[PDB]
Write a protein that binds this DNA or RNA. Structure first.
Ligand code: ATP
Ligand code: ATP
Lengths: 423, 71, 71, 423
DNA sequence: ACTATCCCCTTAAGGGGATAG
DNA sequence: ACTATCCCCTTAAGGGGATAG
């Protein structure tokens, strides 16, 4: 059965799975002329025919959870004909990231435009522990077709006024809720997100919800936005750097085949805010360094797909500190590596601990990124880390678990030392 | 109309247009004196492509070009 | 605005703009990672000039580009 | 004294002649931002400073008559400080071709916007014979500051209703009047212009005026055009292929240094009607062949300078048949050459008589001009020459001198033979 | 029928690095 | 102070000519 692709109620095209299991996609002659017209993916540009490239499959496979065990977790409840992308997509295909919406052709069913069943203080706790049993994406055995990409345990939800309401119909969620993996990962992030903001980085706000014997992180979605009259909840098109180059989740890490500093930076010259984005992607590199984050795999960077085929970086998201993991085990700062390597002389340095300011300016020297600009990113960190830290510390809830802050705040300063010692 | 900010954005744009008017790389090429390979090249690797080639191709499509602010 | 139909029409156009904002070939070049000779080249022999160079220069001037009909 | 440059009442800039006799020009910060803004010459592009290139001088020198004897003819009446471009330009600088208007800075003098003193049946004859004495451009010793480029004897005039009125003030003329050099050159052209039209070529209409013992050709100007309310007579900006590349009248002929088929054709790819103009310039080449015209020197082709710096070919003009010149003297079709050479194998053929269709397709083969298009220009001439000829013949006035037609019509057919014999 | 490649050849862009006017 | 050239090096556009899918 065909599968149609709409965006904020606008038929963009429709996905097709042939007999020989070949996934194809074709635009809608109509949408290829719409005011809103823009490619579903920079990797599937508007054209008249049927696209038949892996790029088609890759884009849609990257819409489902990264783990082969979670896939099977989904085929549980909903009797999907397989763990095959198309099938699941046909099942839990309504609230994917960005704004793509997959509805079977043979099924108009104008599902709930803006519906939601308010959760009970228990119900909330229920879904927030569906990972304890065998219920993926917190989709308990009680009208839920939401989708999120990634590897950890999560589930997105709606949030109207002061209630965590379960999305009903094709109603978009507003918050991507996360659960405890690394112990208090809910905390590691909530901290990492505050600090990032405090340093002038583009990151979404994040609030942590408590449900008895469980802690869950609730992040606000930068791919959602109320409309003019606070009537419709619109979904902003977007994609992760994997979809862009049309690669499979498989190559997320630069150490598999995924993209890294260069490719990416090159791609940004084509942004509508190129010179600026181009700059922020770098600043961030150096921040991922300081807090030693280690998930900088393509699938963690997103560009907004605007009309006419434009695009710009989306705020940075999902940042977790790989620091609380030192000491207790053999694991030490010398073992920590940066998802994307910066250049060096011996090849390309990729170890946080062995890394020094000089290494960034080397990279910022090849890629042609204004040396004078890199100097400024180093100088600004060299003198705001301290203040950034404290003005944050004095915010964490009086119950925020303490080593997390210490463990994260202390190594960070060590690393920063190299900076001040120069800038 | 749509503001383009890259050779790739450009190619896709012009490709669409040719596709839209049912034109062949071969047609346009013969009208403006450039190789049909040159047009195939332009639609997949527009990063390195003479400005002249740009406008000839641009003329065969019967379009112009203007400069506006990136808002 | 004005419809351009040639690399030369283009150069003059962008030259004017740079001149207008009191910019130097050297300034823009440093911001977008290309040689100031590359910009001098572009303003006198734009016929043969990579599209990429085109847009970088185009970005340093804070302008965009669109495609319209030659009426 | 400075010299200002206005176009249809719009200060574009102002020409300056330093002490060391260096001719300079600078735009007006104001005009460099006007709705109408466009370069005075494709050879002097809008820029902030002072232009100091020969291109400045060349453009303005090409506004005055080509003959060093006529220059002196002008310095006669008006006590110009010299035959130096600037000076004359300051004197008879009001009605030049195109639309440039030069008025001394130190002299606003809102001269007659739309004035004209109707000429008497004699007065007309007067100016039409000013070349017999020592009065250039028919500017007799009675408020006249008109200018025309070229080498033969001419003078432009206004034409309101049914009167040949002498332009008054900066009032633009409407017709470029020509006098008898080649005898009845007034006729050679009037014929050549009719035939050109009849074959679908872009040429201005032309009427011949009679003044007793003198015959004068009156051509309509394609660089003039009434405005909305038939109130203002606007002047359309333009320039000849010499000004374009910023070369001196000296190199008008390809056999001096001037431009030829290629250069020109290349330049046309940048037209706003490139593919079309590009085609017509060729067709014409082949026509200049058939009627054997021999003045195809850069200074005979013009592009309109539109807003934003655009440009397109202007209708072809000034076409005289170098045929009536055979027989009587040693002069024979083998002596006749085409101002601009087309390519060949032995180098570049330039002799009408030795030239055959094959030669054009050779040239149309290098320049990359669609062979299929050249085939069509040859085929259309191959079958309209005859009809074109007759439908014309039956028009010439019952007093039109007969060998001109015969002498021109017969050789033409000979040449055409090669065509039909193939197309 | 239509587009993507290819061997092959010459002219050159553009980055290094850098000075003549 | 600012832009036009330059020696020098590598990668390549684009025209000829032309076929694999
Ligand atoms: N706040 C958000 N707003 C919009 N899109 C988001 C947001 N958070 C996550 N996403 C989207 O979801 C995808 C995965 O999210 P995220 O990186 O948070 O997952 P994880 O933390 O599940 O990932 P991993 O385990 O691989 O590190 C991204 O590709 C991104 O497009
Ligand atoms: N009908 C016209 N409309 C507009 N401009 C014209 C017209 N006739 C001539 N001109 C302009 O005047 C210039 C010379 O005119 P033309 O070629 O008729 O002179 P000539 O016949 O005096 O030339 P030559 O003696 O060199 O062959 C051209 O450069 C052109 O721009």
């Amino acid at each position: 059965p065909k599968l149609v692709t709409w965006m904020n109620n606008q038929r963009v095209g429709e996905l097709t799975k042939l007999a020989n299991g070949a996934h194809t996609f074709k635009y809608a002659p109509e949408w290829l002329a719409s005011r809103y017209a823009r490619p579903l993916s920079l990797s599937l540009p508007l054209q008249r025919g049927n696209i038949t490239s892996d790029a088609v499959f890759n884009f849609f496979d990257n819409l489902l959870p990264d783990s082969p065990i979670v896939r099977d977790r989904i085929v549980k409840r909903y009797h999907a004909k397989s763990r095959q992308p198309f099938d699941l997509l046909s099942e839990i295909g309504r609230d994917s990231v960005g704004a793509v919406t997959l509805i079977p052709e043979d099924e108009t069913v104008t599902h709930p435009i803006m519906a939601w069943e308010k959760l009970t203080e228990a119900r909330l706790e229920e879904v927030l522990t569906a990972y304890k049993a065998d219920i993926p994406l917190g989709m308990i055995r009680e009208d839920f077709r939401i989708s999120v990409a990634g590897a950890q345990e999560k589930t997105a939800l709606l949030r109207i006024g002061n209630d965590w309401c379960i999305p009903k119909g094709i109603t978009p969620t507003t918050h991507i809720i996360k659960l405890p993996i690394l112990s208090q990962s809910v905390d590691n992030e909530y901290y990492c997100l505050l600090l990032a903001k405090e340093l002038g980085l583009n990151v979404p706000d994040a609030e942590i919800i408590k449900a008895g014997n469980v802690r869950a992180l609730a992040v606000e979605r930068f791919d959602r936005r109320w409309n003019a009259r606070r009537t419709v909840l619109l979904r902003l098109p977007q994609e992760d750097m994997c979809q862009t180059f049309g690669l499979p989740s498989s190559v997320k890490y630069e150490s598999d085949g995924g993209p890294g500093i260069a490719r990416i930076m090159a791609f940004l010259m084509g942004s509508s805010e190129a010179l600026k984005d181009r700059y922020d992607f770098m600043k961030f590199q150096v921040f991922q360094w300081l807090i030693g984050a280690t998930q900088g795999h393509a699938k963690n960077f997103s560009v907004f797909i605007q009309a006419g085929g434009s695009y710009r970086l989306t705020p940075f998201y999902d940042i977790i500190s790989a620091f609380p993991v030192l000491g207790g085990t053999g694991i030490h700062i010398s073992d920590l590596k940066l998802a994307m390597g910066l250049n060096a002389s011996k090849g390309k340095k990729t170890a946080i601990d062995k890394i020094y300011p000089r290494h960034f300016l080397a990279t910022a020297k090849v890629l042609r990124f204004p040396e004078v600009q890199m100097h400024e990113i180093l100088s600004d960190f060299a003198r705001m880390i301290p203040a950034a830290l404290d003005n944050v510390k004095t915010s964490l809830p009086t119950d925020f678990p303490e080593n997390v802050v210490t463990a994260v705040e202390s190594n960070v300063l060590r690393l920063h030392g190299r900076l001040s010692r120069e800038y | 109309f749509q503001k383009i900010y890259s050779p790739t954005q450009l190619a896709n744009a012009m490709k669409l247009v040719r596709q839209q008017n049912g034109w062949t790389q071969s047609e346009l090429a013969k009208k403006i004196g450039i190789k049909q390979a040159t047009i195939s090249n332009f639609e997949n690797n527009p990063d390195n492509t003479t400005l002249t080639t740009f406008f000839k191709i641009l003329q065969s499509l019967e379009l112009s070009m203007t400069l506006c602010d990136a808002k």
